[PDB]
Amino acid sequence: MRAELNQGLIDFLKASPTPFHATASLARRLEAAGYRRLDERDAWHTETGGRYYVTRNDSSLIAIRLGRRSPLESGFRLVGAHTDSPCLRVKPNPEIARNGFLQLGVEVYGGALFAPWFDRDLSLAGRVTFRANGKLESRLVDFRKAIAVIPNLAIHLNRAANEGWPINAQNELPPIIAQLAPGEAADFRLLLDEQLLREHGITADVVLDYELSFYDTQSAAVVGLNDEFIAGARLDNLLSCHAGLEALLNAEGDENCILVCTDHEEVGSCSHCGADGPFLEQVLRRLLPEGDAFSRAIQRSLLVSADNAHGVHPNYADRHDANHGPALNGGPVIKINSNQRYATNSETAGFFRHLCQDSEVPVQSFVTRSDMGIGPITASQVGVRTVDIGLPTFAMHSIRELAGSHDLAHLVKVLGAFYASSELP
Amino acid sequence: MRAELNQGLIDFLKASPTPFHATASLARRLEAAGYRRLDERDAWHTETGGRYYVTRNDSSLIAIRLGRRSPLESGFRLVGAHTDSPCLRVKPNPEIARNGFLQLGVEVYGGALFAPWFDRDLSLAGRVTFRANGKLESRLVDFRKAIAVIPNLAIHLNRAANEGWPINAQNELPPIIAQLAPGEAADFRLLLDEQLLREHGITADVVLDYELSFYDTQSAAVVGLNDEFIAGARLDNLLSCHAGLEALLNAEGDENCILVCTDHEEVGSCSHCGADGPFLEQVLRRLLPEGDAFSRAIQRSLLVSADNAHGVHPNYADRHDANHGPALNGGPVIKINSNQRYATNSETAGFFRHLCQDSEVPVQSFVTRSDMGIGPITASQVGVRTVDIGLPTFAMHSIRELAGSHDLAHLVKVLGAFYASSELP
Amino acid sequence: MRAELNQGLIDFLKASPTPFHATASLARRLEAAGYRRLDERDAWHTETGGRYYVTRNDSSLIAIRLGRRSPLESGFRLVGAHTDSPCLRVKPNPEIARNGFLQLGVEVYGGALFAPWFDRDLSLAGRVTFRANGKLESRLVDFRKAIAVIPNLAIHLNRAANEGWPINAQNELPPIIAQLAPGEAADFRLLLDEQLLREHGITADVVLDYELSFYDTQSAAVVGLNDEFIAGARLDNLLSCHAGLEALLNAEGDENCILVCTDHEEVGSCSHCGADGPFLEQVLRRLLPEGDAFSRAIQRSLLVSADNAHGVHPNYADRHDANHGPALNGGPVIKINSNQRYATNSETAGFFRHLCQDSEVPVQSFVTRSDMGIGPITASQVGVRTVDIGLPTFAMHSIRELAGSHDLAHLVKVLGAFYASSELP
Ligand SMILES: [Zn+2]
Ligand SMILES: [Zn+2]
Ligand SMILES: [Zn+2]
Ligand SMILES: [Zn+2]
Ligand SMILES: [Zn+2]
Ligand SMILES: [Zn+2]
C-alpha cells in the first residue's frame, strides 16, 4: 500500500527532527530487520549474505547487504541520500534576555528559506555533550513539545511587509522560548541538564556543548482534495532516506546493496562524515581485498543518487524549462546537467529509465532553464558512475515542503528493482 | 615538419567533435602504434616496455609507456590535458516547434562565449544510449553535415545590437534544424534511430538518452598572410591532447610516460572521470606495489599540465600585464599564479624553462594582471609536482579559437624532451 | 531541379566579395549571354531586340533588354537590387604595428553587425588604383587566401562577455594579417603591388589608393536537416542580384526589361553611382526620344524592388507583428510601409500578388510592428511605381545570413513572369 508507505514516512519524519535522530531511526529499523551494527574502530569479519550497518558521528549511516557474488565481480548497487535539512541551530552562548523574554540565538544551517520559519510551533532536538562522573558523553534530546516561536512583526508595524524586505537572520530569527521573572537568571545548559534527567534519567556534572536544531511540531500529513500530496518538513531528503531504506529491506535478489545516507549535504558535504569525506570509500574498501579490487568493483558499480527534484509550480511555471517540468505523482525525475551539477550521463540515465519501464513506474526528465543555475561529489570521491534522480517536490528548503503522495511508492518500487538488478555492466 | 604536425592537428580536430570522439581518435592512433587497451574491470599484468591505454566513460583516456626503470625509483613523467571544450548540448526532451520550425533545446556546457556560436553551420555528434534486442548499449554518432544554425536577429530589428545585450541562453541559443509540415510530428529520438542505422547499421528497439554536442562544420585551417596562425574550434584543449600524443608516440628514452586526457575540465573536473576524480590515481596505483610505493613514486614524478594560455591581444592589450604578454609563435608559456590557480612553483618552472633551453624552444611567462582573476586539481589529488604551461592563443571559449602555427611543433619538441628526461629528482 | 539555381547562387557569391566583383560577375554572365557592353561616354545606337549592359564606377550595373514595343508605349519592366553589403574596409593609411603584429585599420561600411565578424577566416578584395608606365589605372584584386582574422578576447579576460558590451569599432575591429620581425617595416601598398603582379602580371610604379573589403572565406552552403536553408555572406543583396539576372536571361516574351543593381544602397544611396543618383534616369532617357517620352514611358512602367525581408525568427518572434511573420521557403514577401519606408501601394502590391498567383508561387505580407521603424529612392528619382518585395531571411547584416533554399526558385519564377508580362496597372 501507498498508504502504509506514506504513514511509515510520516512516522519516520516525526522520529527524525535532526540528522542524529534520522540516523538513529534508520538504525532501529535496520536492527529490527536483523542488520548488525559494526564499529569503524574494529576489525570486521563480514560474509556473503551478511546484513550490516555502520555510522559515523551518529549522523551518517551506511547500510550494507552483501550478496552472493562478490563486489569485485558484481559491483555494488548503491543508493545515496542525506540525513540533514536546512534549519536553525542553537548557538553556543545562546541566552538572549530582552523585553522580559528569554530567546535563543541561532545560526542558519544550510540554505533555509527564512519566512516560513516564522509563526510556527517549534520544538528543539539534537545532540548534547556532557560530563557525568568525570566521563565525557553524548546523548540525544528532544523536548518534543512546542517550546519556541519566531513570531512575525504585525503588518500594522511593517505596512510594506508584502513588498518584501531582507530578513536579517542575526536579528529576526532568534526564537522566544520563555518569559523571565524580575532578576531571574537564564541558563540554557541547566535546561539541557533537566532534559537529560527527564529523558534519560541522567544527572550531568556539566553540560559542555550541543548541536540542537529547532523543528516544526506539526507532523507531516496527506493533503489535498483527493489526497494527492504530502506536506512536511525534511522531505528533502528524509523522503529519499526512507524510500531507500524500504527498498533495501524488501529488495529481492542477492546483489551487493548499499544505502549511504550522509550528513552535511546541505552544506557542501565537506566533513569527516559527509559525502565529500572518505566515509563511504573507507567502508567499501573494508569489504574488498587490497590492490586493484576496489577500483575494479567500483567500475562495476552504479550509484543512484536520490535527492528531491523540483516539480513545475503552477504559480511560478516560468522557473522551469517548458519541456522539463516534472509533475508531482508523475514518478521519479532523472536530473541532468552537463555541467556536472548532476553526474548523470546517457548510460546512467538510460539504465535508470529502462529500469522504470521494466517496473512500470513513470519516469520524468529535468534540466534547468539554461539561463539559471551528493551525486557529483561521491562519483568524484570513489569514481563511481552515478544517476541523479529525485521525486518532484515544491517549496524545497521551506519548513514545510510538498511532495506527491503516489511518488514514494513509485520510488520504493524502482529502487527495489535496482537493488535486485544483477546486470549493470 | 610543422606542416605535417599542423595537418595532423586539423585532422584530429575534425575527427573529434566531442570528448567521446576525441577519446576514440586518441585510441585509434595509440592502437596503430601498438598500445594495448586495458579495461579497468580486469586485473592487469603489465610489464617493462609495455605500451597501454585505458579509458573511462569513453571520454577520458590515460596512455601509459612503462619504462625500463620502475616508477618507484624513477617516477612518472606525466603530461595532462583535457578532452572537453565549451559548447552546446542537446536537452533530454528537446523538441521545440514554433513558427513552422523544429528546434532543439540546448544547455550551455562550460564557459562558452555565446555570440560566436551564432551564424555558423553546425552539425551534431556524441554518445547515444539505446536498447537493441533487450540489450542496453551505446554508440557514437556524428551527423557530419550541417544540419543546424543559430541565426542572429537582423540588426534592423535590434538597432542597438552593437551596444551589447545579455544573450539569454534559454531563449536565443536553441538551434533550428528543420521546418515541419502542417501537423507533422517531431521525434528527435527517431532521428537518432535513423542515424544509428545509417552510421552503424543498427536498428534500436528504443533510444533512451544521449550526450550530444553541436559543433562547427568549418574545419580548422591555417590563416594569415604568412600562414602564421591556426584557427579552429576546440584548440582548448585538443591542441594539447594532440601535442601530448605526438610527443608520447615519438619520445626517445625509456622513462615511464603517462598521457592523461580527462573530460569535464571546463566544468571543474568533478566527475567519475574528471581530474578531480580518482581515475588517474587508481590507474597509477595499479602500476605499483602496495604500501609506500605510490607515495614515493609520485614524489619522484612531475606533471606537465598543458592547457592553452592567453596571448596578448593587440586590440585588448591592457587585459595583460605589460611584462607578461605572450606572443603567438613565441613558444610555450609557463603559467604562474601564487594563489594556486596554477600549481607551478620555482622548481617546476625552473625545470621546464631549462628543458626549453636545452631543446632550443623559446619559452614565455604569464601571470595575470594583479587586479584580475587540471594542474592544481591533479597535484591535490595525487600530490604530484606540477608545472602549468600552455601555447598562447586568442579567443578562448569561442567556437573558433586562434593559435600560432609554429607553436605545436615547439610544444611537441619540448614534451618529447620531457618524456625522455631521466632526471627530475 | 534548381539545386542548379542554388549552386549558381553559391558560385556567384564566391566570385563576388565586393560590389566591384559582383558587377564583374554579373557582366561576365551577361556577355556570355550575348549582351553588349555600352559605355556612358559614347553615343548609343540601340535597337529593338537589342541586349545591352552598362556600368558606372565598375560597381553599379544596368542590364537592358529592349523588346519589340517601344518603352514609350509599353513601358519598362524593371527589377532593382543592390551590389553592396555591410562589411569592413581598409583605411587609406592602414598599417597598425603592435605587440609584434601587423593589423589593418578598418572603417565599418553600412550597418554591420560587429560580433559575427570576429573569429572568421577573412580574406581581402576590391579595387586598387595605381600608376604604371606613367599612367593611372585600376584593377581588382582578390587575395582569396584567408589572410586575416579579428579574434575575440578570451572569456577568461572578459568574464561578463555574454552580458554584452558596446563593441568599439575603432579599437576592436582591426584585423590581424601578420607578425612582423623586429625592425621589420610594414608596407601595405607594397603588398598590393605584389598582389597586382601575381594576379595580373602588372608591376606598378606606385600604388595610390584602394577600396578593399574584408570578406569571409567560408563559402555559402546549403544547411539543415532537409536542406531547408542557405547560409552565406552577402545574401543581402546578392541573392536578389542573382535572382534578377537569372530571370532576365531566361525570361520569355517581348517586353523592355531592365535589371538595375546599384552600389551604395547600404549607406543611403547618394553617390554618382546610385540609386538616388541619376545613373538609372540618365540611362533610361537614352533609350527614348526627347520631350514628354520619358515621363510617359515611366508612367507605363513598374519597378519590382527586390531586397531581402525579415522572416519571423523563432527565438525572437516578438520582433514581428503576429499577423505578418514571413516563413522562409514561404515565397517572396510583399513589403508594405505607409510611411514610405517601402513604396509598395495597393496597385503595385495587388499586381505582384496576382503575378504570384498566376505563377503558382506562394507570396507573403510584411509590415513592421507599429512601435518599430531601393524602392522609395528610385520611385522618387524617375517617378516610377514600385512594389518592394524580398525573400525572407534571418540575421541580416551578419557576415553569414540565412535564407530558404526554395525561395530563390520561387523568386526567379515570378521575376520571369514579371519580365514577360505584357500589361501592368
Ligand atoms: Zn537534498
Ligand atoms: Zn536541500
Ligand atoms: Zn583548457
Ligand atoms: Zn577552457
Ligand atoms: Zn538590402
Ligand atoms: Zn542591407
Rounded distance between C-alpha atoms, residue C25 and residue C34, angstroms: 15
3-state DSSP call for residue C216? strand
Q: How much distance in Å is there from the Cα of B246 to the middle of ligand 4?
A: 21
Rounded distance between C-alpha atoms, residue B194 and residue B210, angstroms: 14
**Which residues is C104 bridged to in the sheet?**
C95
Report the 3 state secondary structure along chain A: CHHHHHHHHHHHHHHCCCHHHHHHHHHHHHHHCCCEEECCCCCCCCCCCCEEEEEECCCEEEEEECCCCCHHHHCEEEEEEECCCCEEEEEEEEEEEECCEEEEEEEEECCCCCHHHCCCCEEEEEEEEEEECCEEEEEEEECCCCCEECCCCCHHHCCCHHHCCCCCHHHHCCCEEEECCCCCCCCHHHHHHHHHHHHHCCCCCEEEEEEEEEEECCCCEEECCCCCEEEECCHHHHHHHHHHHHHHHHCCCCCEEEEEEECCHHHCCCCCCCCCCCHHHHHHHCCCCCCCHHHHHHCCCEEEEECCEECCCCCCHHHCCCCCCCCCCCCCEEECCCCCCCCCCHHHHHHHHHHHHHHCCCCEEECCCCCCCCHHHHHHHHCCCEEEEECEEECCCCCCEEEECCHHHHHHHHHHHHHCCCCCC
- Count H helices and E strands in chain C, helices first: 11, 20
What grid cell was written down for B328? 603567438
Residues 6+ apart with CB under 8 A from A3: none
Burial of residue A366 (number of CB atoms within 10 Å: 0-12, 13-18, 19+): buried
Residue of B103, B209, B267, B276 to mutate when probing chain A, most A C-beta within 10 A: B209
Rounded distance between C-alpha atoms, residue C54 and residue C211, angstroms: 21
**Which residues is A215 bridged to in the sheet?**
A123
**Which residues is C51 bridged to in the sheet?**
C65
Q: How many CB pairs under 8 A join A and B?
A: 133
By a Cβ cutoff of 8 Å, what residues of chain A touch chain B?
A: 290-292, 295-296, 299-300, 321, 323-324, 334, 336-340, 343, 345-347, 349-351, 353-354, 365, 367, 369-372, 376-377, 379-386, 425
Rounded distance between C-alpha atoms, residue A362 and residue A364, angstroms: 7
Smallest CA–CA distance, residue A371 to chain B, in Å, is 5
Rounded distance between C-alpha atoms, residue C386 and residue C389, angstroms: 9
Burial of residue C320 (number of CB atoms within 10 Å: 0-12, 13-18, 19+): buried
The amino acid present at B314, given as its one-letter code, is P
Strand order across the A101-109 sheet: A135-142, A122-132, A206-216, A87-98, A101-109, A176-179
The amino acid present at C8, given as its one-letter code, is G
**A397 annotated to a ligand binding site:** yes
CA A51, A56, A57, A59 torsion-angle sign: negative
Which backbone phi and psi does B28 adopt, to 5 degrees? Answer: -60, -45
CA C290, C292, C293, C294 torsion-angle sign: positive
The approach used to solve this structure was X-ray
Cβ atoms of B111 and B86 within 8 Å: the answer is yes
Pick from B95, B129, B272: which is nearest to A383 by CB? B272
Cβ atoms of A246 and A158 within 8 Å: the answer is no
Pick from B162, B178, B313: which is nearest to C153 by CB? B313
Cβ atoms of B13 and B219 within 8 Å: the answer is yes
3-state DSSP call for residue C186? coil
**Which residues is A132 bridged to in the sheet?**
A135
3-state DSSP call for residue C36? strand
B174 to chain A: closest CA residue: A370
Q: How much distance in Å is there from the Cα of C298 to the middle of ligand 6?
A: 27
Rounded distance between C-alpha atoms, residue C99 and residue B320, angstroms: 11
Rounded distance between C-alpha atoms, residue A332 and residue A359, angstroms: 12
Report the 3 state secondary structure along chain B: CHHHHHHHHHHHHHHCCCHHHHHHHHHHHHHHCCCEEECCCCCCCCCCCCEEEEEECCCEEEEEECCCCCHHHHCEEEEEEECCCCEEEEEEEEEEEECCEEEEEEEEECCCCCHHHCCCCEEEEEEEEEEECCEEEEEEEECCCCCEECCCCCHHHCCCHHHCCCCCHHHHCCCEEEECCCCCCCCHHHHHHHHHHHHHCCCCCEEEEEEEEEEECCCCEEECCCCCEEEECCHHHHHHHHHHHHHHHHCCCCCEEEEEEECCHHHCCCCCCCCCCCHHHHHHHCCCCCCCHHHHHHCCCEEEEECCEECCCCCCHHHCCCCCCCCCCCCCEEECCCCCCCCCCHHHHHHHHHHHHHHCCCCEEECCCCCCCCHHHHHHHHCCCEEEEECEEECCCCCCEEEECCHHHHHHHHHHHHHCCCCCC
Rounded distance between C-alpha atoms, residue A142 and residue A147, angstroms: 11
Residue C219 vs residues B204, B271, C231: alpha-carbon distances, Å: 37, 40, 9
Residues 6+ apart with CB under 8 A from C208: C129, C130, C131, C136
Q: How much distance in Å is there from the Cα of B267 to the middle of ligand 2?
A: 22
Cβ contact, residue pair B272, A379, below 8 Å: yes
Rounded distance between C-alpha atoms, residue C81 and residue C241, angstroms: 6
Radius of gyration (C-alpha) of chain A in whole angstroms: 22
> Nearest to residue A127, comparing CAs of A280, A249, A23, A254?
A23
Rounded distance between C-alpha atoms, residue A300 and residue A352, angstroms: 15
Cβ contact, residue pair B96, A336, below 8 Å: no
Ligand nearest to the CA of C110: 6
The Cα diameter of chain C in Å comes to: 71
Rounded distance between C-alpha atoms, residue C150 and residue B291, angstroms: 55
Rounded distance between C-alpha atoms, residue B146 and residue C266, angstroms: 30
Element (H, E) at C134: none
**A82 annotated to a ligand binding site:** yes
Burial C266-301 (b: 16+ CB within 10 A, else e): beebebebbbbbebbbebbbebbeeeebbebbbebb
Torsion of CA A311, A314, A316, A318, to 10 degrees: 80
User: Count of CB atoms within 10 A of residue C105's CB?
Assistant: 18
A and C interact (at least 3 Cβ pairs within 8 A) = no
3-state DSSP call for residue C382? coil
Rounded distance between C-alpha atoms, residue C102 and residue C174, angstroms: 10
Cβ contact, residue pair B395, C153, below 8 Å: yes
CA A118 to chain centre: 22
Cβ contact, residue pair C157, B111, below 8 Å: no
Residues 6+ apart with CB under 8 A from C87: C109, C110, C112, C213, C214, C215, C399
Rounded distance between C-alpha atoms, residue C328 and residue C320, angstroms: 14
Which backbone phi and psi does A261 adopt, to 5 degrees? Answer: -120, 110
The amino acid present at B284, given as its one-letter code, is L
Residue that the C-alpha cell 535513423 belongs to:
B194
CA angle, residues A310, A313, A315, in degrees to nearest 5: 155
Pick from C146, C152, C400: which is nearest to B398 by CB? C152
Cβ atoms of B360 and B373 within 8 Å: the answer is no
What grid cell was written down for C171? 579599437
* List of domains in chain A: 1-85+219-425 (3.40.630.10), 86-218 (2.30.250.10)
Cβ atoms of A234 and A85 within 8 Å: the answer is yes
Cβ contact, residue pair A383, B43, below 8 Å: no
CA angle, residues C193, C197, C201, in degrees to nearest 5: 145
DSSP structural state of residue C263: S
Smallest CA–CA distance, residue B209 to chain A, in Å, is 5
Burial C22-41 (b: 16+ CB within 10 A, else e): bbbbbbebbeeeebeebeee
Cβ contact, residue pair C156, B224, below 8 Å: no
DSSP structural state of residue C209: E
CA B67 to chain centre: 26
3-state DSSP call for residue C377? helix
CA angle, residues A417, A333, A403, in degrees to nearest 5: 100
User: Count of CB atoms within 10 A of residue B11's CB?
Assistant: 14
Cβ contact, residue pair C176, B224, below 8 Å: yes
The amino acid present at A368, given as its one-letter code, is T
What grid cell was written down for B200? 552503424
> Nearest to residue B18, comparing CAs of B86, B76, B91?
B86
Smallest CA–CA distance, residue A380 to chain B, in Å, is 4
> Nearest to residue A143, comparing CAs of A91, A105, A198?
A198
Which backbone phi and psi does B355 adopt, to 5 degrees? Answer: -55, -45
DSSP structural state of residue C115: G
Cβ atoms of B101 and B188 within 8 Å: the answer is no
Q: How much distance in Å is there from the Cα of C397 to the middle of ligand 6?
A: 6
User: Count of CB atoms within 10 A of residue A54's CB?
Assistant: 21
What grid cell was written down for B400? 573558433
CA A38 to chain centre: 22
Residue that the C-alpha cell 558606372 belongs to:
C56
Rounded distance between C-alpha atoms, residue A72 and residue A93, angstroms: 50
Cβ contact, residue pair A349, B168, below 8 Å: no
Residues in chain A: 425
Kindly list the residues from chain B whose CB atom is less than 8 angstroms away from the CB atom of residue C113.
152, 155, 161-162
Cβ contact, residue pair C146, B120, below 8 Å: no
What grid cell was written down for B322? 605589460
B210 to chain A: closest CA residue: A346
Rounded distance between C-alpha atoms, residue A345 and residue C397, angstroms: 40
Element (H, E) at C408: helix C407-419
Q: Long-range contacts of range B347-350, CB-CB < 8 Å, 24 or more positions apart?
A: B347/B385, B348/B302, B348/B385, B348/B386, B348/B387, B349/B387
Give the resolution to one decimal, in Å: 2.3
C-alpha neighbours within 13 Å on the C-beta side of residue C83: 32
Rounded distance between C-alpha atoms, residue B126 and residue B138, angstroms: 10
Burial of residue A133 (number of CB atoms within 10 Å: 0-12, 13-18, 19+): exposed
CA B155, B159, B165, B167 torsion-angle sign: negative
Smallest CA–CA distance, residue B224 to chain C, in Å, is 4
What grid cell was written down for B233? 574550434
What grid cell was written down for A13? 519524519
Residue of B40, B41, B133, B211 to mutate when probing chain A, most A C-beta within 10 A: B41
C118 to chain B: closest CA residue: B116
The amino acid present at C270, given as its one-letter code, is C
State the chains in contact with A (3 or more Cβ–Cβ pairs under 8 Å): B
Rounded distance between C-alpha atoms, residue C375 and residue B308, angstroms: 52
User: Count of CB atoms within 10 A of residue A152's CB?
Assistant: 12
Rounded distance between C-alpha atoms, residue C52 and residue C33, angstroms: 10
Pick from B218, B225, B315: which is nearest to C171 by CB? B315
3-state DSSP call for residue C8? helix
Residue of B225, B341, B342 to mutate when probing chain C, most C C-beta within 10 A: B225
CA C206, C211, C215, C217 torsion-angle sign: negative
Q: How much distance in Å is there from the Cα of C234 to the middle of ligand 5?
A: 9
Query: What separation, in Å, do the N-terminal and C-terminal C-alpha atoms of chain B show?
Result: 33
3-state DSSP call for residue C197? helix
